[PDB]
């Protein structure tokens, strides 16, 4: 039907390690939201990994949005993959939480991508963490709980979170998720299991805020997704910035071209419900008139004609991963050519350091020049990842735009 708001949006989604169990979660989340609020559609684990390649491989690969509320907010989730060769799914998912809920199996405690996706939801702007312990089923040892909480929380804080002070529930995503199967219409305080997911929803509700936004300023919207419609057209989805967005506003597609286009918007949907006006904070698809899935892509951001122009080059501080933070083992030298991800864009850039600065060791702050081979969409203070041989490297922000 028509999205009717009748209560605050946030958006949030699941990170952490492969396996861990995010995308058991998320359907949990649906399942155990839906008693109470029956606007709810319940997702079963295989609605979400849904897609050939991802019951092929038998893992999530493509970031998943489902819908769920509380008495307090509406939610938009997106459930994010685990497994380090699909890293860049997983930041383009980040870049559109309010808050991220980060999963991690009590039985086997934090992981190489536990750490990874902290340090790159940070890099994406990700403000608020909620920790899920995961498979408390499996460890009967309370001492490993404390033991895989108290290293959960040392980790948070190595990234800038404040990790003596985020929620950190355990539970059962599998066991709540069966519960609520056998009765869909489990309501709260019946069954343990199903209370953990409402422990979840309720630290959610309340230690993620709503954000400020500016639905004032120039409509911006990074895209983080592009398919085609049969019978429709070309949707680009995602999370919109700032700003508003009505069918009928010609738009501008900004990035990974030479020049930037024109279009108008004709439809305007968040979770398939036609949307009025999009605003700051909706995680919406939006129909583009005129153009195809191969004239539209991630990384580019829709935008008020004019308000935003491309850049390429720029000057940034940047922060050299540690081989024990899974960086590289040794430096670099001006010429060095990795992935740079800012939002959910991913472009190949040049490092080019000052003169007299020959090389850049692991663990070194720094500064230097970085020359996309695309233009993208930039802002000062818009930090970024920086990734190469299928590995993250390091964090930076802009400091300065030159071209
Ligand atoms: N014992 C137990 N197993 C669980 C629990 N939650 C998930 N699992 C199991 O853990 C495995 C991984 O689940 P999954 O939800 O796919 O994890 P994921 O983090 O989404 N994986 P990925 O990184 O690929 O997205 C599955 O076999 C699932 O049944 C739990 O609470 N207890
Ligand atoms: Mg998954
Ligand atoms: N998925």
Known sequence: GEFVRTKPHVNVGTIGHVDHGKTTLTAALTYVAAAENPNVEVKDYGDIDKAPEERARGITINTAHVEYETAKRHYSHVDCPGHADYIKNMITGAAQMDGAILVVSAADGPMPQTREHILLARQVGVPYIVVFMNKVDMVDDPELLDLVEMEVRDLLNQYEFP?????????????????????????????????????????????????????????????????????????????????????????????????????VVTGVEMHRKTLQEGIAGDNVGVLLRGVSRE??????????????????????????????????????????????????????????????????????????????IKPVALEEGLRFAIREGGRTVGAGVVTKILE
Do not use: C
């Open 163 to 263: 990790g003596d002070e985020v929620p950190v529930i355990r539970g059962s995503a599998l066991l709540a998720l069966e519960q609520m199967h056998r009765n869909p219409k489990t309501r709260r305080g019946e069954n343990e299991w199903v209370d953990k997911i409402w422990e979840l929803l309720d630290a959610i509700d309340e230690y993620i805020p709503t954000p400020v936004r500016d639905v004032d300023k120039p409509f911006l919207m990074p895209v983080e997704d592009v398919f085609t419609i049969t019978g429709r057209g070309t949707v680009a989805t995602g999370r919109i910035e700032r700003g508003k967005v009505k069918v009928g506003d010609e738009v501008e597609i900004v990035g990974l071209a030479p020049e930037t286009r024109k279009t």
């Open 295 to 372: 004239e539209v892509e991630r990384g580019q951001v829709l935008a008020k004609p004019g308000s935003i122009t491309p850049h390429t080059k720029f000057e940034a501080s940047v922060y050299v991963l540690k081989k024990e933070e899974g960086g590289r083992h040794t430096g670099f030298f001006s010429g060095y050519r990795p992935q740079f991800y800012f939002r959910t864009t991913d472009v190949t850039g040049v490092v080019q350091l000052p003169p007299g600065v020959e090389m850049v060791m692991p663990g070194d702050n720094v500064t230097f020049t970085v020359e996309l």
